[PDB]
Enzyme design. Sequence first.
Site, PDB file in Angstrom:
ATOM      1  N   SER A  60       0.744  -1.270   0.227  1.00  0.00           N
ATOM      2  CA  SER A  60      -0.060   0.011   0.165  1.00  0.00           C
ATOM      3  C   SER A  60       1.002   1.426  -0.068  1.00  0.00           C
ATOM      4  O   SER A  60       0.197   2.381  -0.203  1.00  0.00           O
ATOM      5  CB  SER A  60      -0.963  -0.068   1.198  1.00  0.00           C
ATOM      6  OG  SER A  60      -0.671  -0.978   2.243  1.00  0.00           O
ATOM      7  N   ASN A 339       5.705  -9.062   6.530  1.00  0.00           N
ATOM      8  CA  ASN A 339       4.394  -8.082   6.938  1.00  0.00           C
ATOM      9  C   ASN A 339       4.454  -8.232   8.517  1.00  0.00           C
ATOM     10  O   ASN A 339       3.784  -8.587   9.138  1.00  0.00           O
ATOM     11  CB  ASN A 339       3.256  -8.318   6.315  1.00  0.00           C
ATOM     12  CG  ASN A 339       1.942  -7.395   6.856  1.00  0.00           C
ATOM     13  OD1 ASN A 339       2.315  -6.353   7.313  1.00  0.00           O
ATOM     14  ND2 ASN A 339       0.828  -7.907   6.590  1.00  0.00           N
TER      15      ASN A 339
HETATM   16  O1  LIG Z   1      -3.585  -8.733  -1.663  1.00  0.00           O
HETATM   17  C1  LIG Z   1      -2.413  -8.830  -0.706  1.00  0.00           C
HETATM   18  O2  LIG Z   1      -1.670  -9.651  -0.548  1.00  0.00           O
HETATM   19  C2  LIG Z   1      -1.999  -7.525  -0.165  1.00  0.00           C
HETATM   20  C3  LIG Z   1      -2.390  -6.331  -0.558  1.00  0.00           C
HETATM   21  N1  LIG Z   1      -2.274  -5.235   0.326  1.00  0.00           N
HETATM   22  C4  LIG Z   1      -3.576  -4.506   0.891  1.00  0.00           C
HETATM   23  O3  LIG Z   1      -4.613  -4.729   0.545  1.00  0.00           O
HETATM   24  C5  LIG Z   1      -3.240  -3.687   2.077  1.00  0.00           C
HETATM   25  C6  LIG Z   1      -2.415  -4.748   3.220  1.00  0.00           C
HETATM   26  C7  LIG Z   1      -3.384  -4.913   4.334  1.00  0.00           C
HETATM   27  C8  LIG Z   1      -4.876  -5.364   3.587  1.00  0.00           C
HETATM   28  C9  LIG Z   1      -5.398  -3.884   3.190  1.00  0.00           C
HETATM   29  C10 LIG Z   1      -4.141  -3.099   3.065  1.00  0.00           C
HETATM   30  C11 LIG Z   1      -3.621  -3.415   4.523  1.00  0.00           C
HETATM   31  C12 LIG Z   1      -4.116  -2.685   5.666  1.00  0.00           C
HETATM   32  C13 LIG Z   1      -2.478  -2.541   5.141  1.00  0.00           C
HETATM   33  O4  LIG Z   1      -2.092  -7.247   1.502  1.00  0.00           O
HETATM   34  C14 LIG Z   1      -2.712  -8.390   2.048  1.00  0.00           C
HETATM   35  C15 LIG Z   1      -3.542  -9.312   2.150  1.00  0.00           C
HETATM   36  C16 LIG Z   1      -3.894 -10.004   3.472  1.00  0.00           C
HETATM   37  C17 LIG Z   1      -3.184  -9.940   4.360  1.00  0.00           C
HETATM   38  C18 LIG Z   1      -2.367  -9.114   4.616  1.00  0.00           C
HETATM   39  C19 LIG Z   1      -2.057  -8.157   3.512  1.00  0.00           C
END
Ligand SMILES: O=C(O)[C@@H](CNC(=O)[C@@H]1C[C@@H]2CC[C@H]1C21CC1)Oc1ccccc1
EC number: 3.5.2.6
Length: 357
Positions: A60, A339
Amino acid sequence: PQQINDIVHRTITPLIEQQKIPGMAVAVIYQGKPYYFTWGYADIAKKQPVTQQTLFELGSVSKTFTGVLGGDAIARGEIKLSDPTTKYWPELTAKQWNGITLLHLATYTAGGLPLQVPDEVKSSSDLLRFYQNWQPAWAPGTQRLYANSSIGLFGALAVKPSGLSFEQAMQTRVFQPLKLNHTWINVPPAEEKNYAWGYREGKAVHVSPGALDAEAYGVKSTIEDMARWVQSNLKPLDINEKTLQQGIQLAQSRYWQTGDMYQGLGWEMLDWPVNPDSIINGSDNKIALAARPVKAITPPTPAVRASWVHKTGATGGFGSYVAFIPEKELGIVMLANKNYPNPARVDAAWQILNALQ
Ligand SMILES: O=C(O)[C@@H](CNC(=O)[C@@H]1C[C@@H]2CC[C@H]1C21CC1)Oc1ccccc1
């Protein structure tokens, strides 16, 4: 300078240990120059180390590129934040869209658009159906709810007058002028050797395709390109392309206030000096992803140099953070292939930058 070296090593070594981060790259931007640091593994199984050329998923943090690209489109006169969303998507005829502007989409204030686009939403007609059926919880411009489906749509609409694809507009209007020559929405085969794996629960993972993924979380980059990105946003007047210089400034304008934070286009800002507990605790997803009432800044404040400007980013396997203080010509990039929790990122960054200012 050993000052920078000691400060970085004293902070990041325990961070990597505590958070069990496989690989990390850091850049400190100080008085107009980058300083780079790397640790650990881009690929555990193949024993590939993190280098200054390793590609990380920005997640993000990609929204800062989307906000600047939108700012550039404004500066070009192709779009206005005051425009109705229906101006650029006339097929969006459901009545709840009356009064929702591009500003609302860019700043998460349209009235509760969801954090994620549903997995089932694939095609352009699936996307239209999804937004047509979406029911707002709040009136436009009253509540902030951080959302891929909001700024993702902003990014897709913002490039429509240009007639270019989102990726092509990003390449031609942002990446190429700023010499971000190892920054990708789609990693080419020739660059795969440098693409780190992310690690989620110990499993090697890369981000999967999704609707509006390029616009909301889809950029991959090196620590060197990200240091260039920070320097570009630190000192926009050094940029020779006029509309890009202007668009960087617009993305750091203050459009809304919640608590002590101001919403820009992609970037988020606080007055410098910050209270560290505010930015550290505020970066927790419990606060950052919660619905909160906003106060309009009428009219928006132009980019304030005495600001802490920042953005956290994540994918399933990666965690990123960027922060800079224009007043002090100072910034930091932290890229990791895990993460790990946001407050740990911001705490490390504030310790490093506070020591150097
Ligand atoms: O598809 C994905 O792998 C990405 C794409 N990233 C996002 O969508 C961002 C990251 C998290 C989720 C919404 C936004 C956030 C609050 C900061 O993240 C994920 C999906 C699942 C678990 C953790 C991350």
